[PDB]
Structure formats: structure tokens, C-alpha cells
Amino acid sequence: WSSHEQMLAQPLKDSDAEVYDIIKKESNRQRVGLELIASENFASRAVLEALGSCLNNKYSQGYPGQRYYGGTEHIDELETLCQKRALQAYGLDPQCWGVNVQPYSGSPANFAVYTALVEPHGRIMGLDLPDGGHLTHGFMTDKKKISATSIFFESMAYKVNPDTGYIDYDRLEENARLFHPKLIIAGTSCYSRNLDYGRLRKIADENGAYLMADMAHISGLVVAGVVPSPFEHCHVVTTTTHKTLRGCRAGMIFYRRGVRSVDKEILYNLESLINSAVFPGLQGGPHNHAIAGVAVALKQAMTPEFKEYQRQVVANCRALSAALVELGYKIVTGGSDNHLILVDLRSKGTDGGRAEKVLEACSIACNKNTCPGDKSALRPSGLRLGTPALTSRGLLEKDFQKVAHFIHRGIELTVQIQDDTGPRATLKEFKEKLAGDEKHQRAVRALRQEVESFAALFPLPGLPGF
Amino acid sequence: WSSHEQMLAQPLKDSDAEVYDIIKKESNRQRVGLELIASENFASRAVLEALGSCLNNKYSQGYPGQRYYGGTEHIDELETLCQKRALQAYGLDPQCWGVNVQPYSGSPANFAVYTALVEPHGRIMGLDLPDGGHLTHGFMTDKKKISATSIFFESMAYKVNPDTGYIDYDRLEENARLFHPKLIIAGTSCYSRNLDYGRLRKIADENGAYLMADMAHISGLVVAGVVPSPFEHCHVVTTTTHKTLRGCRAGMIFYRRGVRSEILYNLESLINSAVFPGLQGGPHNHAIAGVAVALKQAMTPEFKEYQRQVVANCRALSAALVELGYKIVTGGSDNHLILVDLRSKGTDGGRAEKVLEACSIACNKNTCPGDKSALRPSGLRLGTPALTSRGLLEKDFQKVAHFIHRGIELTVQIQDDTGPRATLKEFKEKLAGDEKHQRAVRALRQEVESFAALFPLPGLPGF
Amino acid sequence: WSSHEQMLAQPLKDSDAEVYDIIKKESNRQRVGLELIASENFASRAVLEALGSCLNNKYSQGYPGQRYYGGTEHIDELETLCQKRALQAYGLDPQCWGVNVQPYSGSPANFAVYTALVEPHGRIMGLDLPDGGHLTHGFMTDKKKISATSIFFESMAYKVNPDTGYIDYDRLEENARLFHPKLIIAGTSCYSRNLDYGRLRKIADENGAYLMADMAHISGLVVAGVVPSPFEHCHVVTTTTHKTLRGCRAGMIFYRRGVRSEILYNLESLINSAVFPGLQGGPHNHAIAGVAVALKQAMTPEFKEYQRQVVANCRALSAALVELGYKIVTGGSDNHLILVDLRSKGTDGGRAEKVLEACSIACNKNTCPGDKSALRPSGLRLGTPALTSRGLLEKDFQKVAHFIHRGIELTVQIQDDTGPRATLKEFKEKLAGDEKHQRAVRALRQEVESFAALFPLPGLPGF
Amino acid sequence: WSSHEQMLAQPLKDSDAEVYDIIKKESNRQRVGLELIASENFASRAVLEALGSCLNNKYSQGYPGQRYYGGTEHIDELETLCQKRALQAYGLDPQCWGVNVQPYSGSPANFAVYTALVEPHGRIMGLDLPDGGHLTHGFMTDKKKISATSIFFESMAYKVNPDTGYIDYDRLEENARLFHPKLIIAGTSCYSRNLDYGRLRKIADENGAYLMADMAHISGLVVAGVVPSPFEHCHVVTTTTHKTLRGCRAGMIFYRRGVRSVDKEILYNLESLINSAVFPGLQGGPHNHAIAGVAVALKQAMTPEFKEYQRQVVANCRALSAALVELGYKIVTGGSDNHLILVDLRSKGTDGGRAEKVLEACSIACNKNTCPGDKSALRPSGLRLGTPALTSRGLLEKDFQKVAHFIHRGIELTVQIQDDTGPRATLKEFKEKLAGDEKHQRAVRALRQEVESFAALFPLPGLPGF
């Protein structure tokens, strides 16, 4: 009864060693490994400090102008400040754009928008998953609707030309006239090229649909002006706040304000629809600590240092891509305009499925992903590689070239094992051969050692060992 | 870059003074004020430290043993540990219960469940809002569906007897036969009494429906064993992790496993698939670590005691207000909150919540079972979790009751000066513009804030 | 071809003897039997002649003044004439009412309206089936949606007081506030009392819902002014054109025009668009001509008298059965039918309808308000429209009542021989296999059929 | 009160002169005019006599094996007989096919099937209207769902190659993988070619969807074996009973029974689903008189005389098509395989919209319909012409050639008027110029006279002046 009070102060290290120990082991893993997973990054210490603030304590359902409870004087200073920085960072005119900073994460942001502009069973079109789209843009089979989007709404994806790896805009333009989408999505989870926002705008207006951009993967790039901004032609832009924007996990919803089209003019009604859908529609009390962390991230995002960070991110990607091309690897669409590349491993007689696991054992983090061609989804040809994370650690062109070599050493290993299994062997067996065969296991150890030594050369953003 | 590094490792105080200054002012407001909002509380320092960990960086969409990406060795230790502590804290047998610890918050947890067990347009019944229910349990009018629940699903609420303030179980039992709910919700946002989970189970099984409990408000109480556990009769239990459980903002979904009656339970996969890849993306592992910390703390006798205190404080507060002549809906409480019907003082919570606020006494309005108009709620909701976490005891709350009373009197005064009839905006105008009043507010605010300063404020050292 | 012509102009009797023979046998069955099925009647020869016209050939999708194809000069004269007679027959002012005469039948008419005013998943409330409602008004269980209405829309029925047999309007008024119906239905398939249209209008307007009346069973009565007209308070009135209106099988949708309260009514276009191009294709003009003929006949004093007779027959029949000790649900009737609760004789309509049938007395079972099991309905429904169209009068029906009674006794006998407990199939077995019984049936069948022969059989000369 | 009894007998001619008079004027119009509307025909006297029977009187909800009421002894003989003739007429094995004969009409039959196999919001694909599809196969715009099908279900149409006038099966095959239809429709309202049922079956099975054929327009042809039967590859076949089958207005739903696919085999569950959907799902008491009329039509349909009638129908169409080709008219897909042709009037500088109305004034019945090309739906290029009706009157190749000339005389007239109005004139004005201009009105009279004289030469099926 007395200690209860001593209990609320007691640092985490003392109060709970088991959790603390985990956090440590994780921090250390993150250090010695090479993070190449496109969606990963490292939040600054400032952002992380915010999440721990007393901002966790206040409930503030509603919005600045009107909340359900009182005493929100400061939360209001915060949310408001956060919006000013969100529009500012993207050079948006507060008279043409508004922004909701309450989404809990990326997926939630998208759903809020669908719930506000589409409505139950409304039609939605997005990049087909195996072509590089995201679940939240639609995901169903001929027998079941898996994604929440594909359950409460009616989704149909558009594909990319399997010979150029590019989005087939012509086919999409045609299909839209038959499908009558209420909303078309412009966003990708694994696509190395800029999107033709201008085209998509013509296609959306043609069918009277809304054009929503999902810049979760390029949000940071867009800010530094390293890739074309989606705010030029889109009606709405949703985004995560982590990944390339390097903040804590949360999401935002940008929406236009003002005159939409003449004749005599009609206005944009997105604001209230979207705000009402987030709340009291879908969410409850906002996570203010996460909002503070985003605000911090946006301040940092407008600095020239960030600006430079991004230029570096993209250049690293290019050098990495070039290095792998030179090693004889095939890059979908032959190259990239951003932070990632899809390496088609068919050109080496293996697949990303087996390859991602071997590279992992060597502490080289990345993931598989089908290439435009691929006939089977149960044996994806590609590996996706992103440079945001490692760049935030300081890696430069020279550094990545060495990385490319490490990945190549891995692909070779992966191949060595695969021929050691059989044409009709399963991923289960493959994985099992890699676990109980000192022969390969030794090789792994050797490369893991090299991988982890190199990684140790760079610092690890975050708190002092946390 | 030369500087790019230092930036990422720099402290918040230096890196961003504007945000830091805000956090400070907030920390200080929380200190000198008296938090009586039922849903509020204060997370311990341990929980808060976890949210800042490097756990923010790792993406781990999927589940332990079923992750999309590799390198989840530790996240797995975590999520798993978190589930072991979640079932443990509630004395649940891992063979009869499972638990999803990925929800981002309370509302999301509920939706995940609806999406898994109900399905588009499936019928759902829950406590009607003005009677003390939550939006996520359904909220629509005769012309529009507002809540996500009421949009993607078909909701119809059940009310409470307006003369006892209790849930009319008889009427619900009858209406279920006509509405055919696929799922009935057992949970409240402003209800001072235990729920007849046993009854609701009979009603659910009668219509072959699922009985989902939403213990967001009493999650902490349930753990200390201070209120009956909803796990005895329910098929599913959703909950927030903050509020009375005192963790960071997140949510959990408890579901049964094993035999239902031979027939089994298929809740597990349905619910897991609905959270992901159904509704969410990468889980917020830092929030999960904070919950884990909260659950360890929740199983301590100190927490156990904290809860006993919470409920006792509420009683004393309730008694003190009764003695001051206030009417308590259903006459009392079995938990951490009470709905004070201000009709018995000639005013309403709408005007009263704002005046009390100006005096730094935090709380909120809420219609009472009677109330004919929703635009002039008779009640004020008062909870004791927050102030109890600061150390307040029976004696302390009695003083609090007095402060609230002083407030109600003030709010009434601004009323008599405005006239028995006047719009809410008229009322607030006097509150602000009037020497005797704005002055009165200052006086009570001063006393309120002095008293509050006497107690500590949980959290990280000094913000 | 040499023969191809003659084929198309040949008579049915020669062209197809098998079908012709069937029609004959049916015509003859209809003659010697006693039709007491509430929904049955006999169309006049004029109506029947219309169905055979060349009106079958023309396709006229659309509406007068809005046809897809040309050459509709006459179809237009027809449809238009039909509408003039439909509004006329019900004394409706063409400035306050419009009418669609294209529905293919009763059920289609209702669906057209739901599709126009409700919309996918819109809520609808109607009389619960076991209490006397129609499928099209909603029909689902706790596990499946059976009726089209209950599939594409969200239906919840209201019941009747099981002790008065009357519709519990108080409970309905209450539940509407919780269910938020977009449309409430006023219509019955087996209810002997007038509906409180005035009440239902208050309830509909309270929830901003539409009040749709389904007068399929009393359409003819309403015209003769023998029962209160539903056009006084309703927004829409759907109806079949057969049954008590005595026309061919088809349906109509009456809807209001003008001012609703300034606000207007937008029902017209919604409903017309929903019938076409919404739900149907080319209208069956021959059926429309038959309806027109029926409406002209319906406005005659002879029809007017026919109806008065129909209702009087029912009363006498009801009285005669009461005197024989039978229990009538709600104790009596205000129209053409009565629900005889056979519990008061130790049997059920299920067994009874089949025995009476074997004796050539046509009628059907139907649960009574009380009834605990739907697999053993207590009641028998009896209507007088059909037999009245044959000329039966009070005296005649009293004899009929006796015949039905003789039947109930027989059905009971087969019961006592089977034992207080026995499955329905067991019962029917005795009915058939047993000298004393199959013999008894023959005896009563003979008397039933002799009496029936005494009256004429409306329709075309001799089939 | 006394007369009431005399009222139920009193013939229609006496009981109601106003209706009778109408029926007469209609019968006479049908006689002197030339019916070329593809969906029209003339029911035999036998069929018409059935509709008037006492079969109107019995209520028989349910089905032969189980009805809600009794005394259905004969209705059962009927419905049953009707089904035996429906399967018989199409040479279907009662062990592989079943049939529902209760639909009230064509549209209702389709909906019953959708309600049974698709379910609310289930996806359905069908021929796009402007390409020759039917409303019931789906009809919506980018802003509204018009058809019942497009309201309660999710429909997306497939088009035809605008340069061949044929259905683009390749594009459909592709789109099905993105749309995931639960049911694909094989049926047309204005398409002169056979459908590749075999192809559509591959496409349906590929996506695990049902293949429903809607043979409303070729039902009669299919029976005579003049066009390929859709029962060879389809799971379900819906049809109207009038049109080319020449019965009264009603509809039927044919469905398969037995083993569907092996591995070990799975069965067809269509029967109960469809029956339950018709009733108690969608309809009430069946219209037995209409069913008797259908039965009569099916008996007549199996005769060699009918068989011959159909061969004639198709040959007439060809000669008509040839005659118009020779007159310089353009026929979509250049010809026909059945009873109709879509004449693209662009090749004469006019459109079907103006042309259908002028031909009408000349007592030549037909209708407009957009051609594959057509940029605007408010100025369809084509006219649809069918031969079923006129053939049932006895017209032969020589006769149709004369008909073609009459239609041509009309198109010329139509053109004369149009140049007399202006490039930017409306159909309202066009129609009005044709009504109040003795100049043209005189021409019309002249051709109407010739048209009506010729028509008088042939008999008019049906009753003796009814």
C-alpha cells in the first residue's frame, strides 16, 4: 500500500527487468544488423522523448474548436501546432489544404478516408498487390474479401505492364469507365517509380471520382522535394508518419479546401466529412503523445539537414542499384526514382522467398515481393531493398557498394543451398535444410560476422542504449 | 552529415523548445488541477519509459510465429510475454482463453471484433448512449448513422429503467427475439453498477448471439477482484489499457478457446485475421511494451490495494454529496464512478461542467436516465481513479465533494442572475463577464489548486 | 407453311388436348368443392376474356408518354384508362394520388416500393408472420433471412397482444424509436380486424418514416366502402388485383402527390423508376386490360352489394361456429375472414386442414396469437369472398359451418384413434387407411359436393 | 344485386365496350403495320385461350411436391407437365437439368437467379448495354445504380471490340481476374452473333464463377437447333417464354443437377437455391394460366412446323440483311447468325433516333440502338431489325426484300427531313418538324399507305379479330 506510490516512479529498469532486458536485446540487434527493409527507419531521440511525456494522460475526443471535455488548453496548442507544421512542411496553403493529425497509424488513416468519401460498398480502385500495392488499397480473391477495405467496400485493382514494370495507365483509364470507381488510390508499397498524378487526375475527374494519394513510402522524399509532390493534382493525401518521414508510428490525412470546379462553382466538402469520420466515426480519444512526436518530426523534416538526408537516401539507392546491376542482377523497371528497388532474383536462379530468409540469418534485413512477371505468388522472384534506415546511420555510396556485395554473397549462399535440396522441395524443407546443416550454417556464421562487424561501424539513432 | 547525426541524438528540450514548453505547461496543469473525469488516470514512469524505447522502429506485421518480416526474435518475446501477462493478470486459463494485444486503442479493438464476428450489416445491440453507453456500441438517429459501428453494421440499443437507473434486462430479452442480434455488448461509459453478465449470457445464447463485454472502464477493478469479472459468462472481452488499468493508450481483445458446448470456439483465427491483415498494419510495439509493464504492475498487491482504495474513495465521495443533498443515479455505485443528477439543485451538467472547469475541477456532463432533452443533460460524471493514483483518501475526497458543491452553487448563481430561462452561451457570458463571478471563480480556483498541490503527480521526473 | 398457319389459329381443345383436359378437370374441381380459402375468388368472364386479347403481343417498356418503342398509341389509351379507373374506384383525387398499374403481381408491387423508398438495408417493420403478417412484409429467423424483403433490407416485425389478438400499437410505437424504421407496413394476410391507420400514421411521422398500406386482402372491401379506407392516412397503398377485388393476378401501387407539409411528395418518380427500368421489363398489357375491366366492375352497385354480402356472410358463419362452440380469434371479424382457434376442440389446423380438404372443403391452417409451436398451428382461416361470388347467403353459410364442424369432429376422431400424442404423418395414415374413416370422408365429401353443385361457377362458359 | 350474377358472365364486348374497343383498334394496328421489332411476335390462338382458363383462380404457393394449400391436384399435373415439356423441348436429360416454370416474366427470372446464387453485393458481369446487353445484366453510371441488378448487386460490364462488333473475350478474361465475378452472364438484347459459350465456361471456371445464359432472344432458335444451344457449357439458362419462343409473357429458369467437378467429386446445389429464391423468396402465388400458356407453347415448339418456322426466321433475316447491304447499308459485324441485325445508319448520314420515329409514322415498327462505335448515347447510329414477328405472318425471302425497300424509302425520308432542320437541332424539334410540315407529312402518308397495303396481304395470328 505504501510502495504503490514508490511503484509509480520506479524507473523501467528497476520496475520491470524482463521487459527492459528485451528492449536492450532489441536495441542491440538493431545495431549490429543491416536494415534494408524499405519501410524501416530510426526515430530521433527528440521524437522518442515526446512519446513518454504526460501527454499520454489527457483525453481529448473532438477537435480544437470543440472537444467533449475541458482543460484541453494545451492539447489544443499542440494539435494546432502540429497541423501548422504539417501544412508548412509540404508548402501547402492553409486556404487550399487542411489536415487531420489524429489517425493512429497508416492503415487507420486510409480507412477513415474511405469511410468519409466512399461509404459502404462504394467502389475503390488501387494498385494490385502482386504489382506493388498495399492491402489497405484493396485485397481479395475470387472467393474471399481479406482486407477491411475489400470487405466494407467494393475494390478492384489495376495492374502494371509486366514487361516494363510500370503502371498501365491506359488500361486503368479504360476500366474506370466500366467499374465507376468513387475513389482511385495513388500510392505504392513496392514501386520504384514516380506516379503519374497528373494522369490519374484526368482519369478521376473523368469518372467524377476522388483521387487519393497514399504517400506513406515517399512522405519524407516529397518534403525534401526529391520526388514530385502528390499535392499538385490530388484531392487527398494520406500518409504514415514513420518510414521515410522518420517520426513515430501515426498517420495524417491531408484534404483540400475551397473551390473544386467551375461551370458557377462548386466547393470542396472533404474537411467535415473526413473529420467526422475520424471522430466520432472511427476513433476515440487521440494519442496526444504520438501527435507531439509527429510535430517534432515535422520540425525536423523542414530542416536542411533532413533535406540533405533525403538527397542522400535517393543517391544511396542509385549506387546500390548500380552495384547490383554490375553484379548481374535484374532491377524491375531497370532502376529507381526513389528510396527502393525491387531486385528480380530470377536472373540468378532463385527466389526472394528462400533468399530473404538466408540474408536474414546473415543479419541482412529485407523482404521478398513478387515481380510483375511471376506466375506463382508462392515463389516471388523479387527482393525489396530500401535505403532510408541505413542512410539515417550515415552510410554513403561507398558504404552501400559494400552492402551490395554482402547481399550478393548471400544470394550465392541461398543458391548453394537450393540446389542442395531439389526442384520440388518446399520452403519448409528449404528453411529446415538451412537450420540443421553445419555445412551451410558455417557459411552463414562467416557472413553474419562480416555483416555485423561492418554495421558496428555506424551509430544507431535513438536514446543512449535504449 | 556533420550535423545530421547530432540532430537525431539531441534531446527534445533542445531540439524543439516549442513542443517541450507545451509538454511542461500540460504537466503543470495536470498537477494543480483536480482530475475527476472517469476515464482519466496517470501512467507510471515505467510504462512511460517503454513508449520511448527503440521498439518504435521494428515493423512486425503478423503474429509471433507468423510474421511477414524476419528479425522479429525480440518483438516475439515481447508480444508473447504480453499475452502471458494479460491472461495471467485476469487468472485466465490459456486453454480456455486467448488474447490479441495489437489493437491501437479501445475503439479499434471493438471494431476488430465486430469485423470478425458480425460482418457487414450484421446486427448488434448495446447500451443506448443517453443511458450510459459508448459510441462504439452503436450510435445513430432516425436520419443518420454516425458511429462507424452504426454505419457498417446494423445497431439497435437497449435502454435502462428511467426510474431505477438500471438496465432493463426484461425489455432487452424481449426485443432480442425481434431484432435477432448477432452480437450483444456488455459494457458502459457511464454506469455505476455491475452488469448482469449471467443474464446477458442467457439472452445471448437464446438468440445464438455472441456476448461481448467491453470492460474499458472497469478493467483495473476486475483485476483487483473488486468487481465481478466479465470472463465468467462472456465469449469475448475487449478493453482499453489505460483508464482504470493505468497503462498507455492501447487495447486488447480476449477471446475464448476450447469447447463451447460436440462444438468448439472459432473466435481465435477470426479475430486475429480481422485485426491483421484485416484492419491494421504494423503493430505499435512500444505501446505493447508499455501495456506489458502495466500488466506486471497490475498484478502487484500494491495495485490490488490501489483499486480497493479507488472504490472506497468513490463511496465516500458519493456519501458526502448525498449528505449535501445531491441525487445519485441508482442512488449509489459499485465502482469508480457516480452520475450526479444535478436536477436536484436546479441546474444541469452542461453549465456546471464548464464552471467547475474554470475552478480547475475536471469532470464532464452526461444525461441522466430521466432527461427529456439531450441538449441540457442533468448529470455530471465523477470518477476517482485519477485522484486516487495521487494518494487521495476518504478524508481527501470529502473535501473534494465540498469544492464541487461550492462550484454547483456558483454555477447556480450565474443562473439566477441570467434568469430561469437562458441559452447556454448567455450563461457562459455572465460566468466570464461579471466582477462578482469571474472573481468567485478565481477564489475557488485558488483553493482547488492549493489543495491539489499537496499531492504528487505520477509520471517521469520533471517535465 | 401449308400447316404452320392453321397451327397458330387452331383452338386449344384441338391443338393441345392434354392441357385442355387439365383445365377441364380443374374447372370441375372448382365447381363441386367449397372454396373457403381467404385469398381465393373467381374472375368474371369479361376479365378472363381480356387476358386472351392481342394485348399480349405489344412490348411497351416505359410509361404513357415515356415509351422506349413507338406504336404504343393504344397501349397508352389502356394504361391511362386503367389508372383513371384505379383512382376513380377509390374516390381518389388525381391531384393527391397517382398509381402504377404495371406490377406483375402482389409481391412484386411491394418490392418495387421497398426498392424505391427504402433502399438496400433500409429498415422495415411489419406484422410478424405467426401473428398474421405476410412474407413480403418481412420473414427471417435468428439464423437466416428467407424473404426477399428480409434479404435486401433490414426487417423487424411487431406482434399482436396474444390475449386480445389485436395489434399491440403501444409496443410498436415504443420499438420504432429504437429500430428507426424507414418504412412501416400496414397490411395483413390473416387478421380479422381493421387496422388503426390513424395511429400508424402518428407512429410513422414520429420517426419520419413512410406508412405503406398493403390492402391485398381487403382491396375489394375498401372500394365498396364496407371497411375503412387506408387512403386516409397512408402515403402509399399497394394491392393485388385479385382476391377480394376479383380481377386477374396483378398488382398496383398507389402513391400520393402534392404537399406533404413547404415540402412536397417525391414518391411518384421514385416508384415509377423502381418498377421500370428498375425491376421489370415489358408490362403484361393483357393483365392490365383485365384489371381495368375489374375496376369498372368494382365501381358498380352490384359489386358494391356483393361486398356487403361478403362481410355479412362472414358474420353469420362466425356466429354459427361460435354457437357450435368454436373460439374465434379476437372473438369476431370486421371483414371477409375469421381465424378459428381449434384448440377449443382439442386439435390443430394442421391436421384439420387436410381432413376438411379430403371432404372438398378448401381452407388452410394458420397459427393463432397464443400458439407456442409453429409446427402445430391452432387455427384455421376461413374467408367468404369466393363462395359469396357463387351466391351463397347467410342461410347457405350456416350449412357450410355445419359441414366444417362435421369435419373437425372427423379430424378429432382420427386423433383419438391415434392417441393424444402422434406425429402428423401418423395422423394422415389413419385418415387414409381405416374403413370407418376413409369411408366417413367419402360420406361428407359427397354431401359437400352435392351442396356445392347447387351454385353456379363464374368464368368462361364451359371448360 | 340480381344483375351481379349476370355481371360475372356478360361477355367482355358487352360488359366493357371501352376496353373492348381498345383491344380491337390494337388488333387492327397490329394487322396493317410491319413488325420488325426484334423482341416482338404473335402468340398462337391455343396459347391465348389458355390464359383465359379458370387456372387464374387457384392459389398454389410452393411447388408440386409441397404446397402451402391443398386441392392442387391439377395445378400439379400442369406445372409438372410444363417442366417435362421444357426439358424435353431442349433435349435435356432430367437427371442433368431441372427447370423452374414460375417466373412471372424475363426480368424476374434473372433476378431470382441473382438472389439465389450471387447474394447482396455479389459481383456480376454482363454485356455492356450500349454494346448490346440487357438492363437486367447490369446498368449503372459513374453516379447512380439504375437497374435492380446494379442496386442490390455489384455489376461491371464487358464490352465488344468496336471494330469487329464482336465481344472482346480476351479483355473479359483479363478483367475477370481483377473483378472476381461470382456470376458471368451470357445473353444479349441486340447482338447478331452466337456467343462463345465454350470460352465463357473456361473464364467462369477459372474464377470459380457461375455461367448464366440469358437466351430470351434466341430461345426459339435454340429449340429448332438453328443456333448453337447454350445448355452445352452453361450452369444455368434463363429465358422469357415469348419473343422467339412465341408463347405468352412469362419466364423460366433452367439449372443443372448432379456432379459438377471431380478432384472426389462435388455436386450442383443450384436446384434448391433457385427454387427457394423464386419462392418463398421473391414471388407469391404462381400465375397458373400463364404456365398453361407456356406449356402449350412448348408443345408447339417441338413440332416440325415450328422447327421449320425458325429455319425461315433465320433465312428471312439473311435475305433482309443482304438486301440492305446491296442498298448500301452497313451491318454491324457485317451480318447475322440469327433473327436480327443492327443496321449502322451512319453510312447514310443519319441516326436511329430520328429514323425509328419516321419509319414508325410509316407503320414500319423497329427501334434505335447504339452501334459499337458511337461516341454519344444521345444519337445512336443503329436500328435493330428482327424477323420473328413478320415471319410468323408468312413472309419469305421475296417478301423481306420488298420490306427492305420500304425501310430504305423511310431512311431516305428521314434524311430529307434532317437536312431540313440543321446540324444543331434537337430530337424534339426534329420530331416536331415531322408533325407540323405538310411537305413531309404527305410523303409519310404515301409510304404509310404502301406499307399498310402490303401488310394486309398477310394473316394475323391470334383469335378471330381479337
Ligand SMILES: *[C@H](NCC(=O)O)c1c(COP(=O)(O)O)cnc(C)c1O
Ligand atoms: C473509453 N472512452 C470512455 C470515455 O467516456 O471517454 C472507452 C472506449 C474507447 O477507447 P479509446 O481508447 O479509443 O478512446 C471503448 N469502449 C468503452 C466501453 C469505453 O469506456
Ligand SMILES: *[C@H](NCC(=O)O)c1c(COP(=O)(O)O)cnc(C)c1O
Ligand atoms: C396475397 N397472399 C395472401 C395469402 O394468404 O395467400 C398477398 C400478397 C401477394 O400477392 P401475390 O399475388 O403475388 O401472391 C402480398 N401482400 C399481402 C398483404 C397479401 O395478402
Ligand SMILES: *Cc1c(COP(=O)(O)O)cnc(C)c1O
Ligand atoms: C506501410 C504502409 C501502410 C501501413 O502503415 P501502418 O501505419 O503500419 O498501419 C499503409 N499504406 C501504405 C501505402 C504503406 O506503404
Ligand SMILES: *Cc1c(COP(=O)(O)O)cnc(C)c1O
Ligand atoms: C427481353 C429481354 C428481357 C425482358 O423480359 P421481360 O419478360 O420483358 O421482363 C430480359 N432479358 C433478356 C436477355 C431479353 O432479351
